[PDB]
Amino acid sequence: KYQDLQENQRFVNVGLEKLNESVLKVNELNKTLSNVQANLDRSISLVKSLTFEKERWLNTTKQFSK
């Protein structure tokens, strides 16, 4: 059980770190940008999806403690 728990914690932690660096990269790309409207809308949708993923993954890391 501790091996399974450690594997899940490592997986979700490396996923959250990659997601945070992806948010940083997308924010930097959007700041550089600020077809133009199309990629701006794509960046906005990616920001919204990444924010939703970050919210649900902070929720699941909250419940791993429980």
């Binding site: 450690q6 914690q9 490592r10 932690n13 490396v14």
Partner: protein, 74 residues
């Protein structure tokens, strides 16, 4: 690598990676999920590992079995 440690008696070197994994090359155990800060070793051999996950876990190395078994965590 975030920290480097060496065995004070036998020719063994302990290496801790930036991802939290600790490798003992003359074993591979993930003592902490987050990135570890620093380690200290004192001669039973006790290794104290501190990370940014607000949890410090202490592990001990079995020389005969060539494996690390955790004792307690703060």
């Amino acid at each position: 690598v975030t920290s480097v440690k060496l065995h004070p008696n036998l020719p063994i070197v302990f290496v801790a990676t930036d991802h939290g994994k600790l490798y003992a090359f003359d074993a591979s155990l993930q003592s902490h999920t987050k990135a570890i800060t620093s380690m200290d070793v004192l001669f039973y051999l006790v290794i104290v590992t501190a990370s940014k996950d607000l949890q410090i876990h202490v592990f001990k190395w079995v020389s005969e079995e060539c494996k690390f078994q955790q004792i307690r965590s703060l």
